[PDB]
Design a protein around this ligand. Structure first.
Ligand code: CL
Ligand code: CL
Ligand code: CL
Lengths: 399, 402
């Protein structure tokens, strides 16, 4: 076919849109561009940008106020906390490896037990205990509990693995759940509680570090502009909707609910501009995020509602309240977070941090970031009836 | 701080995960890797076609990394897209001009003068005979309604043109409210609302785009139960839309193509997937193929399998899809034009939505019901939805008086 679109059609097309497309006529200012420039002419806020793994905060004068990496610090206690948490999933994986008839489960569990014994010893080191050296102010009220818990965890998991390898217990998905994950006569606090406790401390550390930094900027929250284009490493399908990104309730918490949720836009296809991260954003890069990205989403919402008043408005629901959410259950159950962990792993839309992210953001908001008043499931709450905290003197690992 | 994580903790950490992370000890086989290895003796394989909606184009690649199909789902050159979208966009353009005026920017007058000039040029080119653009464009799905389509663009130009003329000649007021009452809802001279032109034009755009793909994909041998669908589709500058299945009509459209033989869990919306260099080439590089097939598609699918097969002691959660709303095929068996207007308002206000969601969900369902036979389908804003007393768009429409 030799058919060619008449020029009159392109001229009319380019009158409203196409300004970012190659082929757009050089020199033209279309109706969309006029709109995002008219808004500027006739108290402008901060630009909060979660782009990839970094946070960027820029003021009205295009000056950098904060550049923070969302990546976990080497002195945060993340690796330490996560290593203990992962003992549950590791044992689950080993039960599956056994079911598939792969004998490597025995050698992997032997090494896992050996490495847990080395952790028990290092955790018991005094003075200059690793826990006293970690940068986590929010944990300070519970340092003794955190110590006893890692000790309890190593003792429980170690002696459980020992019993499996010495054939005192059976090994399968069912046995693992009843003999270890749910607890036993010697170790009555379920390992399920240790998994949730450790995750919770990791969420609390991450959120406390961010609140400490963002608080010192004295942001005028009612006028803030929030852009979320956050990528969780290789999870290219997660946190692209507000119900599946705990950064949304977390930012609300930071603002003390003074920032309207409609001022928060998840823009996964927004460009990563060249001057992003510089002390000064270029006017072109600033106008891009402020007007082209944030402004366009905000203006469309206003124009549609102000012009189409004769057309009935549709409202779609948010995702339902599910286990792990702050409001779902009070007090929360440990099983609630286990359910959320499974859901977060299976669902492409979810991040593993959603397991506790939504809960901890709500708790910190409710308790106004006061460490002495917050409850931490798996650390301060969720103990079996009759138990108040993790025991101090725990049996040695018998190999 | 001089703090160093104790080695015992790293050793324990690396026993289960970290195999993809830099810093992972050379030679180690962790528990995740053993599970992966053991499951392979018994996960995701190499067979099945890669169906990739990346930016504006659909790419289909076979197991042998060979290109089977490359089609633009929007902005296809000389396809009726630009022509039809240009007319659809007159409504939003005028809405934007009303806001520019409210903000006290006088540039609305010069932008409207030019908009009116360009609508007059389109009216004339649309009236050309013989060799009318509509008779030349490869749009076989439109063939049953060519006369109606012609009269509608003529009507649209005449209505919008004379409306803008009246505003600039101060015969009418111009604001959000006035625009709705005097133009979008219709007027004494032009009784068919411009709202109907917006639905009609959007409908034809959806129909053309979906028909062109069906014609191309039909000629291919696709093993739908084993297909691997990746959606990283971007509706131009709308950087926040179609990032969830309920806000992307490509999801039901692909289900329709598969004749519901493709499982919805095999469809992943991956907005952060990279646009690889050999994408669009006759042959995808082994690195680029392994990226989309294993790094992108495979990992999402493997995590469903790991959760269900390994976390069997944890109760599963089910979340329903979004409810049916006006503009969905499943919503109203005979659809009302009011439904599409409601969906147009919703699509334009909500950052999660694309304007193509106004009709996309409906047209995918209608086409599927009639087994893609466009001679059997009804088209709201073209064949139906006219004000009481009107059957179609008028033929002789007043000239644009500047
Ligand atoms: Cl980054
Ligand atoms: Cl539908
Ligand atoms: Cl009708």
């Amino acid at each position: 076919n030799t058919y060619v679109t008449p020029q009159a059609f392109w001229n009319l097309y380019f009158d409203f849109t196409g300004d970012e497309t190659p082929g757009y006529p050089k020199g033209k200012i279309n109706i969309s561009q006029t709109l995002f420039q008219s808004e500027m002419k006739k108290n402008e806020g901060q630009l909060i940008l979660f782009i990839n793994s970094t946070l960027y905060i820029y003021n009205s004068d295009r000056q950098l106020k904060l550049k923070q990496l969302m990546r976990t610090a080497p002195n945060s206690g993340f690796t330490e906390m996560t290593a203990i948490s992962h003992i549950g999933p590791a044992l689950m994986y080993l039960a599956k490896i056994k079911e598939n008839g792969d004998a490597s489960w025995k050698s992997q569990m032997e090494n896992l037990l050996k490495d847990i014994q080395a952790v028990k010893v290092i955790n018991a080191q005094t003075p200059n205990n690793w826990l006293e050296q970690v940068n986590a102010p929010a944990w300070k009220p519970h340092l003794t509990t955190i110590h006893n818990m890692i000790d309890y965890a190593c003792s429980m998991a170690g002696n459980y693995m020992s019993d499996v390898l010495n054939e005192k217990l059976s090994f399968d998905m069912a046995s693992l759940q009843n003999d270890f994950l749910n607890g036993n006569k010697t170790y009555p606090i379920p390992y399920n509680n240790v998994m949730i406790g450790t995750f919770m401390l990791t969420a609390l550390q991450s959120m406390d570090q961010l609140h400490s930094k963002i608080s010192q900027l004295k942001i005028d929250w009612p006028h803030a502009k929030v852009i979320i284009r956050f990528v969780a490493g290789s999870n290219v399908s997660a946190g692209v909707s507000k119900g599946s990104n705990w950064l949304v309730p977390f930012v609300q918490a930071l603002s003390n609910n003074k920032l309207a949720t409609d001022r928060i836009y998840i823009t996964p296809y927004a460009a990563v501009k060249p001057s992003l991260g510089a002390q000064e954003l270029t006017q072109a890069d600033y106008n891009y995020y402020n007007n082209t990205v944030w402004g366009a989403r905000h203006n469309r919402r206003i124009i549609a509602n102000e012009v189409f008043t004769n057309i009935t408005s549709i409202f779609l629901p948010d995702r339902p309240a599910i286990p792990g959410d702050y409001t779902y259950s009070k007090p929360p159950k440990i099983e609630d977070f286990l359910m959320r962990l499974k859901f977060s792993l299976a669902e492409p839309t979810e991040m593993l941090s959603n397991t506790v992210g939504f809960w901890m953001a709500g708790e910190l908001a409710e308790k106004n970031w006061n460490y002495n008043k917050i409850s931490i499931p798996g650390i301060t709450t969720g103990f079996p009836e009759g138990i108040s905290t993790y025991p101090n003197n725990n049996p040695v690992i018998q190999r």
